[PDB]
Amino acid sequence: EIVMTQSPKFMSTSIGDRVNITCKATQNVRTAVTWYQQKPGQSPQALIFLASNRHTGVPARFTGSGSGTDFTLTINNVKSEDLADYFCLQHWNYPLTFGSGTKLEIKRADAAPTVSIFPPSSEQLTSGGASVVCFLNNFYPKDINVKWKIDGSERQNGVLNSWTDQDSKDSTYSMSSTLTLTKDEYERHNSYTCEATHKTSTSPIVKSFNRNE
Amino acid sequence: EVKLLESGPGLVAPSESLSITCTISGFSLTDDGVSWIRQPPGKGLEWLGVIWGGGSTYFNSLFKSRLSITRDNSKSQVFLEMDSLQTDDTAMYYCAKHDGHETMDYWGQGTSVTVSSSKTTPPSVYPLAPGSAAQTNSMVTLGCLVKGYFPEPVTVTWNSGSLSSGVHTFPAVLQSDLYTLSSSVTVPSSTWPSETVTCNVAHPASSTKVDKKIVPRDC
Ligand SMILES: *[C@@H]1O[C@H](CO[C@H]2O[C@H](C)[C@@H](O)[C@@H](O)[C@@H]2O)[C@@H](O[C@@H]2O[C@H](CO)[C@@H](O)[C@H](O)[C@H]2NC(C)=O)[C@H](O)[C@H]1NC(C)=O
């Protein structure tokens, strides 16, 4: 059965540029190709149907082209709302098959993270748990290191991280770092520290609190 | 005005059947195909099968043996049944309209299916209020830590949806068979705590909702 290969897994570009995401079929006498946009955490939207036709309410800067094997979704004048995964569906033969997709990355200016640290809630403590949370919000590029320190000494154990996708407005990323300890460990120490190292400064951004204060 | 809405189980035990209902509006099942497609965690989309306008069905040969697709014309519902679920049937399951007998023009919201033996566990929701007045910034960031739930997903909003600018809801992480996520919101400092901020967490699998108000700390 027909494979749709999208050889770029990630495609990089600037606001107002032109980008082509390509999709190369394993067979076909077809213009039986549809193109979709899936923005993070929601459902796909048809952009282009029958290789080179525009779905209603799709703005004029999205165009499609190609025959047989190779197909090209062109995005002119890229906007930040175009942050999404773009993929083709082959509908010439059964089974219908999908490209694995190209996530468009938008290049923007370096921005430093806004860092905030939060002690365990007292609700969490009354339950025997103690999570310390640190948000590093709205920074670029994505590359970032978080160091946790307890009474001045690095903890790598019990730190769980999670990154958002690139924001569709400001093209930034954000990250959440949670240090999970038990209440029993948490109460034996005073000083808790989140340190964010980002290319935007050679100095770490340091957020801390004392449990006793 | 074409809409499609999956309703499914959220959690399914190994070897039990999945069934999902796709309720549609804005077209007639009679005139258009409806396909079922899925997206397992970090993999391509996979088409499962279709039921066309005139009633006939084709399936992906991979699933033929345990798939069935039917519909109820009078309710505008397409039903999927997939038997013998194994953990690798975990995925987001979508139904989608066709343009008659051609293009898949419109996609439903998707419903998450996790194949697992374990219990449903609701989240504990913990408010994240800043530590002792760590200065005036003109903005304050607040959060909810949503800990200890299974399966995915949870939905987070703030003041029931009125507060949507400057929200980050992070993907969940899995530790010791339970998920955890956190969400932040940033509002002007003059306005909190005088104008209240509450995160609302829905965990559909467990039919639970918690609305947690963020109050400044006592410490
Ligand atoms: C990305 O693709 C566009 C359009 O693609 C069509 O034409 C090229 C030559 C072909 O390989 C297929 O990809 C398509 O059939 C490239 O061409 C320009 O862009 C516009 C659309 O924005 C086209 O309609 C124009 O024909 C062409 N400009 C002209 C003739 O002045 C474009 O080069 C390419 N960009 C990159 C960076 O590869």
- Whichever domain contains A130, its CATH number is 2.60.40.10
Residues A47 and A98 grouped into a single domain: yes
Which strands sit side by side in the sheet containing A205-210, from one edge to the other? A153-155, A145-150, A191-197, A205-210
Taking the centre of ligand 1 as the mean of its atom positions, its distance from the CA of residue A198, in whole angstroms, is 37
Residue numbers in A near B218 (CB within 8 A): 122
Q: Where are the domains of chain B?
A: 1-117, 118-216
How far B104 CA sits from the closest chain A CA (Å)? 8
Half-sphere exposure of A127 (CA within 13 A, CB side): 14
Pocket test for ligand 1, best of A13, A20, A73 (most atoms within 8 A of CB): A20
Residue B210: its H or E element: strand B208-213
Alpha helices in A153-210 (DSSP H): 183-186
Residues A135 and A195 grouped into a single domain: yes
Q: What angle do CA A203, A180, A198 make, to 5 degrees?
A: 20
Residues A184 and A119 grouped into a single domain: yes
Residues A20 and A76 grouped into a single domain: yes
Backbone angles phi, psi at B109, to 5 degrees: -70, -15
Interchain pair A176, B47: CB under 8 A: no
Residues A101 and A127 grouped into a single domain: no
Check if A22 has its Cβ closer than 6 Å to any atom of ligand 1: no
Instruction: Determine contact, residues A102/A85, Cβ cutoff 8 Å.
Output: yes
Atom 17 of ligand 1: nearest residue by CA position: A74
Closest CA to B185 of B217, B154, B140: B140
Q: Could you tell me how many CB contacts below 8 A there are between chain A and chain B?
A: 141
Domain boundary among A76, A108, A140: A108
**Which atom in ligand 1 lies closest to the alpha carbon of residue A63?**
21
Residues A102 and A161 grouped into a single domain: no
Taking the centre of ligand 1 as the mean of its atom positions, its distance from the CA of residue A70, in whole angstroms, is 14
Looking at 3.30.70.260, 3.40.640.10, 3.40.630.10, 2.60.40.10, the CATH number of the domain B118-216 comes to: 2.60.40.10
Domain boundary among A108, A132, A163: A108
One-letter amino acid of A140: Y
Residues A179 and A100 grouped into a single domain: no
Taking the centre of ligand 1 as the mean of its atom positions, its distance from the CA of residue B70, in whole angstroms, is 44
Residue numbers in A near B94 (CB within 8 A): 43-44
Experimental method: X-ray
Task: Tell me the three state secondary structure of residue A108.
Answer: coil
Closest CA to B21 of B4, B1, B38: B4
Instruction: Determine contact, residues A191/A150, Cβ cutoff 8 Å.
Output: yes
Extract the tokens encoding B191.
């306005």
Closest CA to B79 of B66, B67, B63: B67
Residues A117 and A92 grouped into a single domain: no
Residue A25 CA: distances (Å) to CA of A71, B62, B151, B157: 8, 20, 36, 41
Taking the centre of ligand 1 as the mean of its atom positions, its distance from the CA of residue A104, in whole angstroms, is 18
**Burial class of residue A119 (count of CB atoms within 10 Å of its CB; 0-12, 13-18, 19+):** buried
Closest CA to B168 of A159, A164, A171: A164
Alpha helices in A40-159 (DSSP H): 122-126
Task: Tell me the three state secondary structure of residue A86.
Answer: strand
The Cα B142–Cα B198 span in angstroms is: 10
DSSP class of residue B29?
G
How far A170 CA sits from the closest chain B CA (Å)? 11
Domain boundary among A49, A74, A108: A108
Taking the centre of ligand 1 as the mean of its atom positions, its distance from the CA of residue A42, in whole angstroms, is 30
Q: What angle do CA B160, B165, B170 make, to 5 degrees?
A: 80
Contacts of B196 (CB under 8 A, 6+ apart): B159, B213, B214
The Cα A73–Cα A87 span in angstroms is: 9
Atom 14 of ligand 1: nearest residue by CA position: A65
Query: Domain tally for chain A?
Result: 2
The Cα A32–Cα A112 span in angstroms is: 45
Q: Do domains B1-117 and B118-216 have the same CATH topology?
A: yes
CATH superfamily of B1-117: Immunoglobulins (2.60.40.10)
Half-sphere exposure of A61 (CA within 13 A, CB side): 11
Which candidate from A34, A95, A101 shows the least CB-CB separation from B103?
A: A34
Closest CA to A157 of A174, A130, A176, A178: A178
Closest CA to A35 of A71, A77, A82, A59: A71
DSSP class of residue B174?
E
Contacts of B55 (CB under 8 A, 6+ apart): none
| A10-14 and A102-107 beta bridge pairing | parallel
Residue numbers in A near B169 (CB within 8 A): 164
Residue recorded with tokens 């960031």: B141
Instruction: Determine contact, residues A88/A34, Cβ cutoff 8 Å.
Output: yes
Residues A59 and A131 grouped into a single domain: no
Residue numbers in A near B186 (CB within 8 A): 114, 137
Q: Which domain holds residue A132?
A: 109-211
Interchain pair A162, B181: CB under 8 A: yes
Largest CA distance in chain A: 72
